Design a protein around this ligand. Structure first.
Ligand SMILES: CCOC(=O)[C@]1(CS)N[C@@H](C(=O)O)C(C)(C)S1
Ligand SMILES: CCOC(=O)[C@]1(CS)N[C@@H](C(=O)O)C(C)(C)S1
Ligand SMILES: CCOC(=O)[C@]1(CS)N[C@@H](C(=O)O)C(C)(C)S1
Ligand SMILES: CCOC(=O)[C@]1(CS)N[C@@H](C(=O)O)C(C)(C)S1
Ligand SMILES: [Zn+2]
Ligand SMILES: [Zn+2]
Ligand SMILES: [Zn+2]
Ligand SMILES: [Zn+2]
Ligand SMILES: [Zn+2]
Ligand SMILES: [Zn+2]
Ligand SMILES: [Zn+2]
Ligand SMILES: [Zn+2]
Lengths: 265, 265, 265, 265
């Protein structure tokens, strides 16, 4: 009996289904796939990308940037929700192919630098090309690109480095406070007494509170379904979106159920 | 007028004054200098070093290890209080010259990897040879070496990655809970509204509480004077040592005074 | 049409077929799989591993080390032929699970550090968990472990960092000069006018000459078939092994044929 | 007796004496100090910097870029002769303060990444803030920025990663082939039988031949005096410059004298 072959990280087709750019606000576009968020924020002083999705999405992202008028040199900054393969997958390649630099917190930078390997919960099962961060950010730190101010809100749990990013855009003449909140799920995680993450539960509870309180006229999430976005629904893509409060409440209720199931399991 | 010459990080002579090993408990020795802590914990399955002091201390540390019966191959693990040049200085060289691997939290690992450069408060003024961590630890995680169990207690503030390490040794037949608590000082730091560390004050306040509650029959600190140790006093070196509670209270009182002076300054 | 799913690096079953340790000389054992070399050199001062094979081989390697009397702490050093996924695959995990440190040349270290991503010829198609080198070696540099002297002979081509490692063991009372020579193949490579490797052809020609001249009573290669080893043949596993001269001549003849086919293709 | 204080890397004042930009050809300017080269190549698609000098030169470089019409976002690329502190010193800071990415060969990248520490000859005596390379280049590889084509010519010796960079500019309507050739000195180096660099002599001899044959209407060197440039001499700064052939011959004659002195010493 030979050792097993390596298994690739395969995903639902919709996660890999390209879509054309979908405008969220005056400067903010969804440019990823139907079921993975990748946000382009376009400014008079260059563009910012928040997440890139799966590794094989680099060229599609670049096509959509081009459709928007953003050349590779115009992409200045990549920000991440968290450094798993389905959100940070193409970062290394985008850095090679654009002017983009990565800003991330220390936890995300170290996970990004090992390509998602030695994950606290997934081990080496879900990896991707490693990349280096160019700037380390602290909780509450701001980065400004052509006058869009992005604020980091750490919300550790799904990964130690999970981050919400907030900024204010405009729409129909009025401010829109956009909150790109990270995942609050714990898929197959050992929650209680995890030797690799001993304060996991406390971190999730603090993160629910952080998400609940974000400035949040519009919530977006790395998996759009988690905030009830439907990117394929066109003019009504965001009509059913949750508030940050509702998103945090739903995640906490699910988390509490998982804790009870783990105790019983 | 030429640009200024580079300025070396110079320190009081006592910080660089070698001392012979000073026993703290059955397996735990101070092996650094008179005024910089470097703790050797010797076990039947190899040795652990907590901090190394200044960069030029590597050979002295190695001499004292040898005096204790620890060869380079026997040194298994280096742990750090925080990754400033006067505590992590010789880490890179010790890794080259021993079997030692470094375990640190993500913040300390990223600061260690850039040799203390781009410090949030010191800039590039206090740097040292960079080194890589071999293991990333999470808050409350344990590492066990020949049955001495070391527990990490994050106490962010002096650096984002500041850590207290605790373990239980023996003395005169009874357990001794040793707490190696990191610095709680903020030397020349901008405390309020620091764009590079926006939650600095909240982190220090949480860290005072963490230090106050540590398991702590014996407190040691990276600068021995901060816990009222006198390594040159022989049999009474630790006689005047503070409790963890007293250390935390003194640091908080000093911090509060610094906050008031900063507001007035 | 969705973007394609990620494809895993799959290999012939024999590459993944565990075997028991096979003695090559008094201190040198093959401990990998039937069709991937991983050499254990056991000394009174610890053990050296040369290559590890595929990523999923870590636990098997560790089992065979244990069978040989080598515990994780006894493994001191990992050396590499080249940093592709089927030879360096388990390095990261072995470093986490043993005392082992990696020594490699700069080219191999940088490819190892990006987990084989952005390969000059394979792109991101054949990746693995990234790892850091602990020591950078120069051409002709020696490393000594318990008195086995390992010499590095750079033989760039298959990868920029391809290395032959040589050492002298004993057998039946007499010296045996062992040469672990790297691959000299160029599978699907663009040889002529490659913008990512402009001196590729010159490097291969110099490497054929290097391999031809190695001290070489016994030749071993990362893919055993390349040197006509049959690890499953027991007492006659090495009976048909090529000389280094014959190996270099065969590789050059194949290379010349590939050059002619590329010109015609 | 305390251990000695750290010693800063101090240099002749002229190495730190700022100068205004000095035009070499239509797109190429010296923007460093009187006695350290830092070349700015300005193109319609952004700017390239070759070397930066000492660590404390970052702001001066940025001032001279601004004087030339180059903002921080316009600096696209940093190339290096070699990664010693007096040529790569400010790279880390320039990357933080500009859009610039670093391209270097593997040897230079690994030395840059450890801030010049563990130098083959200098040890930790001459260090600087570490930086990461964004692109690894191979010998003879080209990089093109707004149609200036830069070619790498490895010339190992002074450091393993020493590189000459060549490109074609214009002047008075005609092409000017500029060669920025690295140092060929070996200051205090052990040349013969160096265990850290066993093929040192062979590499220097090959590098003399490489430099002799470069395309070279105008030779520039990291230390201008080595090619008989006088940056403070204005309109005649380059009048006495050596050819590449003369530079290589002089370096080889000096090297041969050093070899003879080492044998006698
Ligand atoms: C079990 C493997 O899990 C994953 O690869 C992800 C990565 S975010 N996490 C899951 C989750 O968060 O429930 C998901 C299905 C949304 S994708
Ligand atoms: C002002 C520079 O500061 C330092 O280099 C250190 C490093 S810990 N911090 C100081 C402090 O903590 O007060 C110190 C004097 C104990 S040394
Ligand atoms: C085409 C992909 O190639 C590979 O993944 C390897 C890695 S060494 N190279 C091949 C070769 O060297 O011919 C091989 C079949 C021996 S495996
Ligand atoms: C002895 C220390 O040396 C150096 O720091 C440099 C760095 S290039 N090398 C010298 C040389 O090349 O002769 C120099 C004086 C030009 S500066
Ligand atoms: Zn995730
Ligand atoms: Zn996901
Ligand atoms: Zn400090
Ligand atoms: Zn200190
Ligand atoms: Zn290969
Ligand atoms: Zn192979
Ligand atoms: Zn130099
Ligand atoms: Zn120099």
């Amino acid at each position: 009996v030979p050792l097993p072959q390596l298994r690739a990280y395969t995903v639902d087709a919709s996660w890999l289904q390209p879509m054309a750019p979908l405008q969220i606000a005056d400067h903010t576009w969804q440019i990823g796939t139907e079921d993975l968020t990748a946000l382009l924020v376009q400014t008079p002083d260059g563009a910012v990308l928040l997440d890139g999705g799966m590794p094989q999405m680099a060229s599609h992202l670049l096509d959509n940037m081009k459709a928007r008028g953003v050349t590779p040199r115009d992409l200045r900054l990549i920000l991440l929700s968290h450094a798993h393969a389905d959100h940070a997958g193409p970062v290394a390649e985008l850095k090679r192919r654009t002017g983009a630099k990565v800003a991330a917190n220390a936890e995300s930078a170290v996970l990004l630098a090992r390509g998602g390997s030695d994950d606290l919960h997934f081990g080496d099962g879900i990896t991707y090309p490693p990349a280096n961060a160019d700037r380390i950010v602290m909780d509450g730190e701001v980065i400004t690109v052509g006058g869009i101010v992005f604020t980091a809100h750490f919300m550790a749990g799904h990964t130690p480095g999970s981050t919400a990013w907030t900024w204010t855009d405009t729409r129909n003449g009025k401010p829109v406070r956009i909150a790109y909140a990270d995942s609050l799920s714990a898929p197959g995680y050992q929650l209680q007494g995890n030797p690799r993450y001993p304060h996991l539960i406390e971190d999730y509870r603090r993160s629910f509170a952080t998400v609940r309180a974000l400035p949040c006229d519009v919530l977006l999430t790395p998996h759009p379904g988690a905030s009830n976005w439907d990117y394929a629904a066109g003019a009504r893509a965001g009509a059913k979106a949750l508030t940050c409060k509702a998103y945090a409440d739903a995640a906490e209720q699910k988390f509490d159920g998982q804790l009870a199931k783990e105790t019983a399991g």
